[PDB]
Design a binder for this molecule. Structure first.
Ligand SMILES: CCCCCCCCCCCCCCCCCC(=O)OC[C@H](COP(=O)([O-])OCC(O)COP(=O)([O-])OC[C@@H](COC(=O)CCCCCCCCCCCCCCCCC)OC(=O)CCCCCCCCCCCCCCCCC)OC(=O)CCCCCCCCCCCCCCCCC
Ligand code: HEM
Ligand code: HEM
Ligand SMILES: C/C=C(C)/C=C/C=C/[C@H](OC)[C@@H](C)[C@@H](OC)[C@@H](C)CCc1oc2c(O)c(OC)cc(OC)c2c(=O)c1C
Ligand SMILES: COC1=C(OC)C(=O)C(CC=C(C)C)=C(C)C1=O
Lengths: 73, 365, 85, 42, 99, 89
């Protein structure tokens, strides 16, 4: 796969600046944090639950194990 | 050039795409530290353990090369599992050749790390050699013969240690050749990306964009490796391997290396010899079936909520199995492990393909 | 230098090109620079001067790039920028 | 030569203004050079 | 109402947030590639730009302003008539190959 | 109105040059100049005097992709010195 033979594109214009003319960290915190927060919130419902379940199974099983090793659980 | 410099790459691949180069680095690191350790290691059972302590105590910087090799093997697996997870989530497995070679790579690295762990001839070395080679005894009619043939005798002994040094020595170079083939098949298609949509309309050159990003990734890998080597070299290891091998006694709380714990939990959950071995083999080989189980009209899970939820359930389940593998075969761990083992195969064989079909329906195609 | 000398003199051939050189030169230089002067300026250029003036304007300087048509293969700006050194 | 041709070759009109001057008026002449783009007049 | 979870799903899937239409996200196999090849200039060029805009947003880990999100009710299958015929043609050939 | 405002501010005697080349004498040219361009304004005033500020150069790139055209055109340049600089030679 070589540039020149990838695919067909028509009517698209792209404007760019030299890396020497611009900042490498534009609005790093001012805009970065909001974006991180957004991304974090957008996925949390899909990522976290299974791990919460793991936590519950983990704490439940460990406690159940200890309790079972003593005279009066 | 054109295999690197002007290689076309998607403009949007994320950090999850850094693990391939990190695996290459883990491989080089293991080969370099490995060769240097091999310059001072002797494979006779009377002197193996001794030669390792000699490396760590008297060879200049022998200790750092050794712990870099030990912890490097752990980093290798962390990266391997991240690499496979990326593939499942983004549908990279549709690159069939690349994917199946990858499965071979996973098995070869597992076999390679197994044999290396046997080399210092500590307690875990010895019992690991015993158990794992014995998996072959599940093969009907000839299984036991295969095991004795591998051992070079009726039990793990000198003949075993010496050939394992040889196998462990050459296998990584074979892995390197297989990895080059892995990349060649990949180059025929170029990389997949987070969207699962062809990126031919927006390719950028690998250099300088990903060369610098890979270097940043390499730096982070080295930080993680060195935090372990310089601040907690034994954290991911097992104290029992600091005890020389004793053929008359298996430690009471013997457990596998952490990266093998999930598979060990699965095998332990089945109270049948052949059944446990078949489940173990299948827990890895099922990766070869993923492509045939793809029902979604879309390649990646990025736009598939239900599939994502089941994907993280699988990761959480492997985390559960890893934890269970580290616990004694007692209540309620026996049952939690059996459920987790069943859930593993159920998510892959039934729930995910089903979520794929439901999502298609919801999109009306 | 020889190519330049020939281009200068052959261009100022005919009343129109000379008339234009007069009008534009007064606006740009504020005077008509005679061929003998251009000759002196040209004669003084040697390999050293060419290296120094080219280095001054081309060497490790950011270029401006414009592309139009089937340009999938036009190099990326960073790659073009690194070609400046 | 030193001077580049008026039009470099390789291998729009929509108004009456841009069309004026397009009609031929003299016999054809073909030129070929060592250093300059070829041309064909008339 | 199924339809209720459908609009919910559409927004949860989120390709609309990148300005994509459902058909822009289909996995490309040979049938799909042939169908894309058969698209008229305008549908092809529009697809290319939407995918390009989406890849760009993905690279910046960004999304479009909500007002620019593809709307569920306005998403239509521009690829369907083409892909359906390509599949029909292949099935016909496969039937003939068995006779 | 835009055109007259533009011409008003820009077409001033001090910004123009009557040039001639050929079989003619400078004295006749000048006399004709005096005869026909004398009434040419030499003062818009002081509130107009259009003056050029320098123009910043930006290392950058503009790519208009159009695979429908048979050949690609590419133009690349660095910032040059300006008319009056000796370096131009
Ligand atoms: C344990 C496992 C150990 C394994 C070994 C380690 C493997 C590491 C994987 C590679 C990750 C590094 C990498 O190359 O990705 C660059 C990755 C991409 O971040 P970026 O360059 O800022 O890109 C901007 C986003 O695309 C645009 O997104 P944004 O605008 O929201 O900004 C995100 C950014 C900035 O946002 C803020 O935090 C502010 O936050 C950061 O990532 C920092 O940066 C890192 O994660 C490492 C930065 C450390 C210094
Ligand atoms: C010694 C082990 C391995 C090495 C050195 C290795 C290396 C690589 C490299 C260099 C890449 C490109 C960068 C990237 O996208 O990550 C890659 C891509 C890929 N590898 Fe591996 N690999 C290894 C094991 C595996 C395994 C175990 C699997 C999965 C069972 C696998 C599946 C893939 C797939 C499907 C791709 C394409 C990724 C995409 O474009 O999305 N690899 N590998
Ligand atoms: C895929 C790459 C490799 C992996 C995953 C790997 C893994 C391992 C593991 C897990 C051990 C046990 C470490 C311990 O706790 O002591 C080991 C030991 C060892 N490895 Fe490797 N190894 C690799 C490549 C190599 C190569 C190429 C050589 C030598 C040519 C090598 C030489 C050694 C030697 C001599 C030892 C014994 C001393 C020691 O235990 O540190 N390894 N290896
Ligand atoms: C000559 C070469 C030979 C014979 C190579 C054989 C390779 C086999 C497989 O690799 C492909 C194998 C390593 C891989 O199975 C897929 C692992 C996940 C198996 C994990 C594994 O580890 C254990 C371990 O490490 C131990 O350590 C002290 C102790 C163990 O129980 C007491 C185990 C164990 O019960 C299992 C299942
Ligand atoms: C196209 O995929 C590839 C990479 O992924 C970013 C690599 O890091 C590296 C290193 C190679 C050689 C490669 O081919």
């Amino acid at each position: 796969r070589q540039f020149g033979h990838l695919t067909r594109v028509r009517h698209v214009i792209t404007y760019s600046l030299s890396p020497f003319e611009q900042r490498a960290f534009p609005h790093y915190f001012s805009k970065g944090i909001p974006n991180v927060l957004r991304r974090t919130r957008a996925c949390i419902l899909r990522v976290a639950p299974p791990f919460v379940a793991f936590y519950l199974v983990y704490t439940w099983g460990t406690q159940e194990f200890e309790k079972s090793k003593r005279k009066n659980p | 050039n054109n295999a690197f410099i002007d290689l076309p790459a998607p403009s949007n691949i994320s950090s999850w795409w850094n693990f391939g180069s990190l695996l290459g680095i883990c491989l080089i690191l293991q080969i370099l530290t490995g060769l240097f350790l091999a310059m001072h290691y002797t494979s006779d059972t009377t002197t193996a353990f001794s030669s390792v302590t000699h490396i760590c105590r008297d060879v200049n910087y022998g200790w750092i090369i050794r712990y870099m090799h030990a912890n490097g093997a752990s980093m290798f697996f962390i990266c391997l599992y991240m690499h496979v997870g990326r593939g499942l989530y983004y549908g990279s497995y549709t690159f069939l050749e690349t994917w199946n070679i990858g499965v071979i790579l996973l098995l070869t690295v597992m076999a390679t790390a197994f044999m290396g762990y046997v080399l210092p001839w500590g307690q875990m070395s010895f019992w690991g050699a015993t158990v794992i080679t014995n998996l072959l005894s599940a093969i009907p009619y000839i299984g036991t013969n295969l095991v004795e043939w591998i051992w070079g005798g009726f039990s793990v002994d000198k003949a075993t240690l010496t050939r394992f040094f040889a196998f462990h020595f050459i296998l990584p170079f074979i892995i390197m050749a297989i990895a080059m083939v892995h990349l060649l098949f990949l180059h025929e298609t170029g990389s997949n990306n987070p969207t699962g949509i062809s990126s031919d309309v927006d390719k950028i050159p690998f250099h300088p964009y990903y060369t610098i990003k890979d270097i940043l990734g390499a730096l982070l890998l080295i930080l993680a490796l060195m935090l372990l080597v310089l601040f907690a070299p034994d954290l991911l290891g097992d104290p029992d391997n600091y005890t020389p091998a004793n053929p008359l006694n298996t430690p009471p709380h013997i457990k596998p290396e952490w990266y093998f714990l999930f598979a060990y939990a699965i095998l332990r959950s089945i109270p049948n010899k052949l059944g446990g071995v078949l489940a173990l083999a299948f827990s890895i080989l099922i990766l070869a079936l993923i492509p045939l189980l793809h029902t979604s009209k879309q390649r990646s899970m990025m736009f598939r909520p239900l599939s994502q939820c089941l994907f993280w359930a699988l990761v959480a389940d492997l985390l559960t199995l890893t934890w269970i593998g580290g616990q004694p075969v007692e209540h309620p761990y026996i049952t939690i492990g059996q459920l987790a083992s069943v859930l593993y195969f159920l998510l892959i064989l039934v729930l995910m393909p089903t979520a794929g079909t439901i999502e298609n329906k919801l999109l009306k195609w | 230098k020889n190519l330049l000398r020939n281009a200068l003199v052959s261009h100022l051939d005919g009343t129109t090109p000379v008339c234009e050189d007069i009008g534009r030169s007064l606006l740009t230089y504020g005077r008509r620079i005679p061929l003998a002067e251009w000759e002196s300026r040209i004669a003084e250029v040697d390999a050293r001067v060419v290296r120094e003036v080219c280095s001054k304007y081309f060497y490790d300087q950011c270029p401006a790039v414009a592309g139009f048509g089937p340009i999938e293969q036009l190099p990326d700006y960073n790659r073009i920028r690194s070609g400046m050194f | 030569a030193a001077v580049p041709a008026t039009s470099e070759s390789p291998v729009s009109v929509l108004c009456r203004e841009s069309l004026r001057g397009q009609a031929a008026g003299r016999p054809l002449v073909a030129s070929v050079s060592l250093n300059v783009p070829a041309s064909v007049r008339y | 109402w199924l339809e209720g979870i459908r609009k919910w799903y559409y927004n949860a899937a989120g390709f609309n947030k990148l300005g994509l239409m459902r058909d822009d996200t289909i996995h490309e196999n040979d049938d799909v590639k042939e169908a894309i090849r058969r698209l008229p200039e305008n549908l092809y060029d529009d697809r290319v730009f939407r995918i390009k805009r989406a890849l760009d947003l993905s690279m910046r880990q960004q999304i479009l302003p909500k007002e620019q999100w593809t709307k569920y009710e306005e998403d239509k299958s521009y690829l369907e008539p083409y892909l359906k015929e390509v599949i029909r043609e292949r099935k016909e050939r496969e039937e003939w190959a068995k006779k | 109105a835009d055109l007259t405002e533009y011409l008003s501010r820009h077409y001033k005697a001090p910004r123009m040059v009557l040039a001639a080349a050929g079989g003619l004498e400078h004295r006749q040219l000048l006399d004709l100049a005096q005869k026909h361009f004398s009434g040419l304004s030499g003062t818009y005033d002081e509130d107009a005097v259009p003056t050029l500020s320098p123009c910043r150069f930006t290392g950058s790139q503009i790519c208009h992709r159009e695979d429908g055209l048979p050949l690609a055109h590419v133009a690349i340049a660095v910032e040059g010195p300006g008319w009056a600089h000796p370096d131009n030679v």
